Structure formats: C-alpha cells, structure tokens
C-alpha cells in the first residue's frame with residue numbers, strides 16, 4: 001500500500017520529459033533573440049537531444 | 051549604414067575612417083576585410099546596417115548576397131541568407147536584393163539579412179506574381195536602338211556606321227567576328243557610351259573574361 005510499482009510507460013515518459021525540458025530550455029534560449037516571420041517551428045528544436 | 055556607400059569609397063578613405071575609429075591598423079589587409087572590420091565596428095556602435103547585392107543559391111540551401119564591385123566574389127563582404135527566405139519570398143539565383151543586415155553573432159563571420167527592402171528594385175509582394183524566363187514567348191526585334199547621338203565627333207561616326215551596317219534592337223543577338231588587333235575594345239566602349247547616353251532607362255551591363 002505504500003510501495004508503488006512503475007513500468008516501462010511512466011519511466012519512458014519521465015525520460016522523454018527530461019529530454020523535452022532540455023530541448024525546451026534550448027529552444028527558449030534560442031527564441032529569446034528570434035524575430036517574427038523569420039523561422040518555422042522545425043529547426044527551432046533539435047532532434048538529437050531527444 | 052549602407053554597404054554601397056563604403057563600396058564606392060576608395061581604399062584611402064576606408065583607411066582614414068578606420069584610423070578615425072581608433073582600431074588596429076586596417077590599411078594592412080584586404081579591402082574586403084577592411085570593409086568587413088569597419089562594418090563590424092560601426093555596427094557594434096551604430097544603427098541598423100543596410101546592404102545590397104545579387105544573390106546566389108548554394109547547394110546547402112542557403113544563399114550568398116555578393117557585390118558587383120568585387121565581381122560577385124566570395125569573401126567577408128558577403129551577406130548570408132537563410133533558406134527560410136528562399137521559402138517565404140522564394141528567392142532565386144540572380145535576384146537583386148537590398149535590405150537590412152546585422153553583425154554575425156558568436157562564431158559566425160557572415161553578416162545576416164534582416165528584412166528584404168527591395169527585390170530587383172521592386173516589391174516582394176510583386177516579386178511573387180512574376181513570369182518565368184523560358185516560359186516567356188520570345189519574339190523578333192520590335193524596337194530599334196538609336197546609336198546615333200547627332201554630334202559627329204571623332205569617334206561617334208563609328209557608331210553611325212553601325213546604324214547603317216547592322217541595326218540593333220531590343221532582343222537581338224549580336225556577334226562580332228574580328229581577329230586580334232582590330233579595334234573592337236573601344237568599339238564596344240563607344241557603343242556602350244552611345245546606348246547609355248541615348249537610353250538611360252535600360253540597365254546596361256558589360257562582361258570581360260580573361
């Protein structure tokens with residue numbers, strides 16, 4: 001009743017959330033200088049850290 | 051600050067301006083990186099920067115805006131343009147672009163474009179609604195080019211001879227067959243002077259190879 005079991009689901013979800021917050025900090029530091037109508041939401045986030 | 055302004059300046063004026071800015075000796079290096087470094091300084095402390103040139107698309111997707119005074123050569127004077135412009139305004143190889151630029155940030159060495167002000171001396175909105183080149187319908191020469199000035203100097207008569215030997219009009223293909231040492235150089239020079247004097251409305255370009 002006090003011990004909780006975790007599976008592949010929420011473990012992978014937490015790892016993906018860590019990757020997501022990493023790339024979110026990255027894209028937030030990048031967007032702090034970006035301007036309007038000069039980029040698409042494709043190259044703003046890098047696929048490699050995920 | 052306009053790029054073409056520093057472009058039409060001689061090297062001595064660039065040297066004087068760089069020494070007025072109080073920097074490392076700039077007269078030591080290329081006009082190319084001379085303009086590069088003075089622009090980097092004046093843009094560290096200065097307005098929006100402005101520039102103009104002709105665009106060439108690279109195989110990486112991005113493009114380079116280069117100057118004709120450097121005969122469209124690669125160097126620090128070039129302006130980097132992203133493929134996002136070539137998607138938004140759908141830029142092309144050989145477009146006369148003029149717009150705002152900024153210094154390159156950390157690790158970059160090419161000035162980045164900000165906003166296209168004039169595309170081929172025209173509106174970007176009107177840059178979309180255009181006609182393709184080979185998609186055009188060619189035609190024979192309709193309007194003749196007047197080469198006779200009417201003054202009759204020592205060299206103008208040369209052009210007059212052409213006016214009675216082989217009339218030229220807009221859209222015609224001219225081919226000059228001449229051996230070496232035949233006086234074709236100032237022939238083209240007089241022709242260019244006459245067509246620039248008679249027709250200042252059509253943009254006139256020359257090409258010298260080797």
Ligand SMILES: Nc1ncnc2c1ncn2[C@@H]1O[C@H](COP(=O)(O)OP(=O)(O)O)[C@@H](O)[C@H]1O
Pocket residue numbers: 204205208230231232233234235236
């Ligand atoms: N319109 C002209 N009037 C007078 N002299 C001319 C004219 N055109 C050519 N010439 C003569 O021809 C020579 C041109 O030399 P150059 O320009 O080297 O010919 P090319 O370029 O064909 O070798 C000059 O010496 C000049 O005296």
Ligand code: BEF
Pocket residue numbers: 229230231232233234235
């Ligand atoms: F060699 Be010359 F210019 F005909």
Ligand SMILES: [Mg+2]
Pocket residue numbers: 233234235
């Ligand atoms: Mg010659």
